[PDB]
Design a protein around this nucleic acid. Structure first.
Lengths: 99, 224, 151, 127, 206
RNA sequence: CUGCAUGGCUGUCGUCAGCUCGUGUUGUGAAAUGUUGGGUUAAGUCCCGCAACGAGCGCAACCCUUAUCCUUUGUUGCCAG
């Protein structure tokens, strides 16, 4: 069928590096690959009072951006499956596979 | 340089009668058209004598500071100055370049840090304002201190275009015992000048002649 | 406006008649950014005024505006501890704006059933130079002619 | 081949496909009249066909999402002109002067801490 | 006025995060507390090992601590011993299995945290604050800092009225987001209370 | 309990245009000049002028986002033929 990998991480330059790794590996190991597609970034936000007591208008405004990548692999050639499946990827990337 | 050679450039032209400084009576041929005419009989031997002492100074590895900040001649003084491996001041003279050199020296360090960093250190990653804002500073320092940036110490002589315009620089020299060679036009005060060269100090054709001559004799004095 | 002088935004013209002037009018009558509902009231008032009062819709508008237009006014001023009243000759562009503005304000301060009927009857009154809006011009002049000495 | 122009305004974005023949207009599968209940806004989509002349000269087939009434009508205005320029580009000078080429960049301004809105400030009591 | 935290403002720009793992909302809090408990544990046991910085990341079901230290042999101890005993209790605290990495702090006098701690420890020894600061500055510059300042606050020398004082050589553009500004903190618990130390070091731009 | 013993954090004048240093020079000296002036800038911003010449912090720039476009990638987004 197909194997699709969802990649999410807080850092972009680092996420598409992990993406790049996977795609290339696939492309070299003679898999056919749809993607990588940029799936919309879900940015949480936080607003917190900046003073320990009172001064309600004094605040910090933080956000955590969560980046999303879809890697779609058309042919699951076993060499490809082994190629991918012991890649060494950035620790701070969460990798999901659909089967 | 030759009497014939000088006359063509208009070295002999001076300011009006109304603007003269009396001290310069000896070096004026006379006047025509309400304008003072300088004596080229007096100019050349005095000028040649200026070149000789410059030639001597240059031959003991002497450092020569060309000074001329007139807007019209600012570039000519630079090329003249660089053509002989020496140093210049071609825009507004900062008071205390010599007498307060220790402090002005710091600005030189600043200059080098800036062009070095902007090239080898390169940055080009900036904030977008610093590109111009740091260039702004560097741009300014360059005109002010581009010519003495590598002077290292106090100069051994000053060559000056217009003694009145550059009275500040000639006064600092005087205090530091540095000899002053200067083009001293009919309106100016020749007292500050050890070797007085009396001739036009404006006209680019006249200016380039002395300067062209000056830079050439440095190389002869250098070539040994 | 201490230092920065400016131009002025040059609003689009009235959609129906292509008049910048009526665009200055609908906007002045507009409330809570209800443009859609503002021009509806201006037209129906013009339509009420036009239909049953000799037509010439743009001209009818001017006949009324001609009457509430003020030639001079006073500008308050505080000199040597004194609040003097200096009568200033006012410029044409604003002349229209005051004229339009007083017509609109007098319309809402009226007894009739809707703003359109009110607006219509204000224009009519102004057209005959009577009513509140005209009276607003006259107070401006009485107040101006009084301090004529300090111009 | 279709001649195309993208237009957008506020949070709206209108795609605009030009073809010759008629005074037809179909926004989101619907008619111009049907889509916009406001007749003024109807005029703005017509405008790019004023200086540039269509009567029964070309078909514009369009669609749009985002923003509201005037956003969608502004955005379509914008996209047509781009599709007109696509067809010639000589036309522009007219369109420039019209004010129709420009992408109106005025977005709603964000709501800021300590303020009631983007600029409205909490009422200030002296005492 | 109040200044923005110069490490914080530069995160993503020219300064790295010190925690760099990913986690969903479910366990983000738990991870963040676990981080706190390990940093605390290590920071005490290695108090005299000149630990300037602890990086934590969490690959799969793991955690690996990097201890940036100006005294690696101390932290490591004879043939891996001390590393190992740290590992076994980090893994306890962390829940998941654990690995420890050790990165040399080559020039600690350029490390704002070890500068700040060094002054901190010196106030507790009873050194004079002007000396300690001035040794820090001088040191930092002769080693090629573009600039440095160190501040000291509260009850200097046991003074009844609390004071704030700083020294500054060279260049410290805090408004330049490009500027490698290494900023950190330390508190001196003294017989007459707490003396805070702030330190900034400018190391060039981009 | 003491914010009148403190650290850390915060309000505030106020994103107001300020705050300073080296060398030079002036004054017996505290200090001054630089940074007293004419214009102009959001701005000690810039330019002329200038016994000052230069420099550092703050201004601006480098950072996020928004307005046009180009390349890459098309699923869960898209539908011109």
């Amino acid at each position: 069928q197909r194997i699709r990998i969802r990649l999410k991480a807080f850092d972009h330059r680092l996420i598409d590096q992990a993406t790049a790794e996977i795609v290339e590996t696939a492309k070299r190991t003679g898999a056919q690959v749809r993607g990588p597609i940029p799936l919309p970034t879900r940015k949480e936000r936080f607003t917190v009072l900046i003073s320990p007591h009172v001064n309600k208008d004094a605040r910090d405004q933080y956000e955590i951006r969560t980046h999303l990548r879809l890697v779609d692999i058309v042919e699951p050639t076993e060499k490809t499956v082994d190629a991918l499946m012991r890649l060494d990827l950035a620790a701070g990337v969460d990798v999901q596979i659909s089967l | 340089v030759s009497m014939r050679d000088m006359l063509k450039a208009g070295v002999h032209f001076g300011h009006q009668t109304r603007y003269w400084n009396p001290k310069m009576k000896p070096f004026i041929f006379g006047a025509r058209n309400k304008v003072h005419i300088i004596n080229l009989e007096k100019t050349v031997p005095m000028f040649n004598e200026a070149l000789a002492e410059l030639n001597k100074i240059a031959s003991r590895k002497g450092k020569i500071l060309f000074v001329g900040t007139k807007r019209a001649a600012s570039e000519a003084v630079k090329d003249a100055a660089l053509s002989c491996d020496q140093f210049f001041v071609n825009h507004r003279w900062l008071g205390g370049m010599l007498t307060n050199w220790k402090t002005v020296r710091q600005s030189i360090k600043r200059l080098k840090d800036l062009e070095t960093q902007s090239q080898d250190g390169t940055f080009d990653k900036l904030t977008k304002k610093e590109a111009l804002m740091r260039t702004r500073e560097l741009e300014k320092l360059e005109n002010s201190l581009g010519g003495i940036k590598d002077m290292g110490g106090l100069p051994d002589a000053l060559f000056v275009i217009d003694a009145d315009h550059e009275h500040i620089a000639i006064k600092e020299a005087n205090n530091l015992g540095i000899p002053v060679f200067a083009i001293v036009d009919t309106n100016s005060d020749p007292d500050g000048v050890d070797f007085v060269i009396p001739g036009n100090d404006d006209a680019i054709r006249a200016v380039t002649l002395y300067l062209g001559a000056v830079a050439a004799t440095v190389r002869e004095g250098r070539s040994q | 406006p201490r230092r920065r002088v400016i131009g002025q935004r040059k609003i689009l013209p009235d959609p129906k008649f292509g008049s910048e002037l009526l665009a200055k009018f609908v906007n002045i009558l507009m409330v809570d950014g209800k443009k859609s509902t503002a021009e509806s009231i201006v037209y129906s008032a013009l339509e009420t005024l036009a239909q049953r009062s000799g037509k010439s819709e743009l001209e009818a508008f001017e006949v009324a505006l001609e009457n509430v237009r003020p030639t001079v006014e006073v500008k308050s001023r505080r000199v040597g501890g004194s609040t003097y009243q200096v009568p200033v000759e006012v410029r044409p562009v604003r002349r229209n704006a005051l004229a339009m503005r007083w017509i609109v304000e007098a319309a809402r301060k009226r007894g009739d059933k809707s703003m359109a009927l009110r607006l219509a009857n204000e224009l009519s009154d102004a057209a005959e130079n009577k009513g509140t809006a005209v009276k607003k011009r006259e107070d401006v002049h009485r107040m101006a002619e009084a301090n004529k000495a300090f111009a | 081949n279709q001649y195309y122009g993208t237009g957008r305004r506020k949070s709206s974005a209108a795609r605009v496909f030009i073809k010759p023949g008629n005074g037809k207009i179909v926004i989101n599968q619907r008619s111009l009249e049907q889509y916009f209940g406001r007749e003024t806004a109807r005029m703005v989509v017509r405008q790019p066909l004023e200086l540039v002349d269509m009567v029964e000269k070309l078909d514009l087939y369009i669609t749009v999402k985002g923003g509201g009434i005037s956003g969608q009508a502004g955005a379509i205005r914008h996209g047509i002109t781009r599709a007109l320029m696509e067809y010639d580009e000589s036309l522009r000078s007219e369109l420039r002067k019209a004010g129709f080429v420009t992408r109106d960049a005025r977005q709603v301004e964000r709501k800021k801490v300590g303020l009631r809105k983007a600029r409205r400030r909490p009422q200030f009591s002296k005492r | 006025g109040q200044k923005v935290h110069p490490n914080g403002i530069r995160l993503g720009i020219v300064k790295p995060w010190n925690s760099t793992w990913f986690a969903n909302t479910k366990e983000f809090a738990d991870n963040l507390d676990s981080d706190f408990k390990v940093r605390q544990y290590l920071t005490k046991e290695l108090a005299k090992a000149s630990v300037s910085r602890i990086v934590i990341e969490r690959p799969a079901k793991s955690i690996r601590v990097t201890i940036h230290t100006a005294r690696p042999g101390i932290v490591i101890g004879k043939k891996g011993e001390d590393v190992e005993k740290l590992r076994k209790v980090v893994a306890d605290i962390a829940g998941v299995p654990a690995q420890i990495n050790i990165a040399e702090v080559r020039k600690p006098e350029l490390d704002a945290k070890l500068v700040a701690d060094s002054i901190t420890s010196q106030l507790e020894r009873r050194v004079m604050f002007r000396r300690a600061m001035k040794r820090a500055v001088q040191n930092a510059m002769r080693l090629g800092a573009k600039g440095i300042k160190v501040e000291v606050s509260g009850r200097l020398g046991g003074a009844e009225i609390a004071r704030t004082e700083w020294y500054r050589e060279g260049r410290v553009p805090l408004h330049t987001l490009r500027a490698d500004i290494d900023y950190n903190t330390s508190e001196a618990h003294t017989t007459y209370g707490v003396i805070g130390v702030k330190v900034w070091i400018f190391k060039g731009e981009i």
